[PDB]
Each structure stands twice: as structure tokens, then as C-alpha cells.
Design a protein around this ligand. Structure first.
Ligand SMILES: FC(F)c1nnc2c(C(F)(F)F)cccn12
Ligand SMILES: FC(F)c1nnc2c(C(F)(F)F)cccn12
Ligand SMILES: [Cl-]
Ligand SMILES: [Mg+2]
Ligand SMILES: [Mg+2]
Ligand SMILES: [Mg+2]
Ligand SMILES: [Mg+2]
Lengths: 194, 194
């Protein structure tokens, strides 16, 4: 019933552009929308996000998260490890690479989502969500070495999976951080499964 | 130790703008970023709300109520939590109950309300509250519920059992061209991982 008629460039930066989208509404009326896209997609999706489950014997299972300054937010955010997929990179390879660069952890693919939308009211941005387990008892994960890219500055925050939502609420309360919506959504469903 | 130095407008639409963000990196060095923001954010604690609507009915499994809409930015149909922008002077809780009734017909009861969480913090300043609402599907109000879609709003309601959410989403994606929202996928993944 609905579809794109045309896109008009409003403004293109190096990494992001603003388009004016003309589309057919399901009554047969023509309508316009202001749409954000990345200029970087070549790719099943723009990015991967990694759900990293740190498994250590005789410890609570943890979810490994990252804290970073986010210039669009003007502040620090708590997020799943994540990055853009390199041209010709698989989502799985991107996941293990981003997880190792951001956390220094070496993990195993458990499962990989299809492309899922980040904010479909505003952007065409998509990611693969990639569930990875980390054998925290293996020697390679003893002293995990975070290898940042140029300009990346990442703090690792491991939180017990069984209390994730309460732990995130605490950090926000004490640390004035913004929690990522996908991290918060995961933490909610862990509580709601009960 | 990182902070914003300046925000230079690049391009302002009616609904979205692109900014050149200048910030201090943690080595004491000036860098820039391309940042997306909405033009619509006034005194709201966030741009929007997304609703996690748990439909509860005697001798039924709990359903998660989802909506399917054409999203011009994506050029296609997306499956999302009911969601909308917070009106000037509207509370996140009132926005969530209003958007839930407008998009699905269902009259919910507030359960919980997140702090402001970031939609895509590497790209935008966009934030939502994630509001968990229970719907009493035994109430006569919620019997044959009628969406009240706004102007140029066309929403289909999809209620899926919480206990099978991820496989039910996977089956919808296998049967037509559509994108699942990243927050819905993150929530369905955590239900499986619990
Ligand atoms: F920011 C973009 F998402 C965007 N572009 N158009 C809109 C509208 C409009 F009513 F104009 F269609 C409402 C809300 C957001 N919009
Ligand atoms: F698209 C915007 F999110 C955006 N602005 N700058 C960047 C960079 C840069 F390396 F330049 F810093 C990398 C990735 C995305 N960026
Ligand atoms: Cl798992
Ligand atoms: Mg990253
Ligand atoms: Mg990285
Ligand atoms: Mg909406
Ligand atoms: Mg609406």
C-alpha cells in the first residue's frame, strides 16, 4: 500500500546526510518525511551490537557493556560493544572484532539477528545484534587487552545478568550516565521473563 | 574529562537538524563529529516514549502488543513497540498511555517508566522513556479495541505471546519483507536468554 516515490538531498556531511522523502500514504495521498541516513553503508546493515555474556565458573554470569563519551549526546553513555561493519566484513567477524577492540575479550558467536532498525521514525540505520559468550576462565580472557581505534576511548562495565536492570538504574542514579535503549530493553525483558 | 566545545548548525529542517559538534577528547585534543538532533524537543525529559504493553487475560499467555507501520526513513514496514513524541507539557507516562490508545486502541495501566535512554548515541541526541504498561484484556474497555490513528498515521496491531516472542518475530520476518526494531529484538532475545 505505501512506498517511496523520491528522495531529495537536503545536506550531506562526510558520515551523515539529511533527505526529504516523498511517499504514498495508503489513502493515495503524497506526503513528505525528513529522513537521516549514514553515507557509509556499501553491507547487511550499518553496524553490529554485541550482547557479550561473560561466563566464569563460581561467578554470576555478566553482560559486558561499554561507557564512552558520545558527542551527539553531549555526555557519557552505557551501551553494548558496537561498531560499523567494514566493507566486505561479515556481521559475525565485525562482532568479534568490535568486542575485542572495545573490551579486549575474545568470544564465540552464539547467534546473530537479521538487520534490525535503530530509530526507523528518523533514520534508515540498522544493526545486527550478535549474542557472543566469553569463556572468562580461558587464559586469553585472563587480562583482557582493549585495542581502541584512533579517537575511541572506552571504559568496560561488566554487570551481573541476574540483576542487570537494578544495576543500570543505580549507575544512572549515581553517575549521571545515559543507558542505551537496546541495553535497557534487554535488562527489562530479563526482569519480565519472570 | 570529555565535553562539548561548540555545536555549529549545518542544516535545519522542520523536524531534524545536522550539527558539527566540536568536543574535547580525553588526551586534551579538539575533535569534531556529525550529530543529528530533533527540532521538536522543548522542556521534555526525552523526545519520545516507547511502550512495552503486556496484554494480560485470564486463561491466556501474556502477549506483547506490537505495531507495524510504513517508516519513510527505512523505505519499508517496521515492527515496533507503540511509540510517539512527547507533547509539550505532557508527562512520559501520559504520552505512553495516549500513544498506546491511539496506536492500538488498548487502555493500559502504568507499571514502570525508565529514565531517558538514547536511541542511537553514536549518531543522534534522540532519547525516549521506555514505559512498561499492563493491559487488562478482561476489561470491556479492551474487548474490541479501535486504533485512533492521527493524520497520516496507519498502524496495524500485532500481539505475540511473550513466551514465544523471538520465534514469532523470526516467523513474521521469514514470511514478508519487514524490519524488526532493535529494541523489540533486544527484548525478545532477553526473554529467550532468561
Ligand atoms: F523528523 C522526521 F521524523 C519527520 N518528518 N516529518 C515528520 C512528521 C510530519 F508530520 F511532518 F510528517 C512528524 C514527526 C516527525 N517527522
Ligand atoms: F556520522 C557521525 F556519526 C560521525 N561523525 N564523525 C564520525 C567519525 C569520525 F571518525 F570522524 F570521528 C566516525 C564515525 C561516525 N562519525
Ligand atoms: Cl546466552
Ligand atoms: Mg563502538
Ligand atoms: Mg571499535
Ligand atoms: Mg508512533
Ligand atoms: Mg502516534
Amino acid at each position: 500500500k505505501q512506498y517511496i516515490i523520491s528522495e531529495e538531498l537536503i545536506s550531506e556531511g562526510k558520515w551523515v546526510k539529511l533527505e526529504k522523502t516523498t511517499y504514498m500514504d495508503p489513502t493515495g495521498k503524497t506526503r513528505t518525511w525528513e529522513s537521516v541516513k549514514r553515507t557509509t553503508r556499501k553491507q547487511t546493515a550499518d553496524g553490529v551490537a554485541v550482547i557479550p555474556v561473560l561466563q566464569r565458573t563460581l561467578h554470576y554470569e555478566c553482560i559486558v557493556l561499554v561507557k564512552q563519551f558520545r558527542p551527539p549526546m553531549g555526555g557519557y553513555c552505557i551501551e553494548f560493544p558496537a561498531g560499523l561493519i567494514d566493507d566486505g566484513e561479515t556481521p559475525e567477524a565485525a562482532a568479534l572484532r568490535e568486542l575485542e577492540e572495545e573490551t579486549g575479550y575474545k568470544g564465540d558467536i552464539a547467534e546473530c539477528s537479521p538487520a534490525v532498525c535503530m530509530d526507523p521514525g528518523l533514520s534508515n540505520c540498522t544493526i545486527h545484534i550478535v549474542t557472543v559468550t566469553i569463556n572468562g576462565d580461558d587464559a586469553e580472557n585472563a587480562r583482557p587487552k582493549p585495542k581502541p581505534g584512533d579517537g575511541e576511548f572506552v571504559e568496560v562495565i561488566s554487570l551481573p545478568k541476574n540483576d542487570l536492570l537494578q544495576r543500570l538504574d543505580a549507575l544512572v542514579a549515581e553517575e549521571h550516565l545515559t543507558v542505551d535503549a537496546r541495553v535497557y530493553s534487554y535488562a527489562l525483558a530479563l526482569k519480565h521473563a519472570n
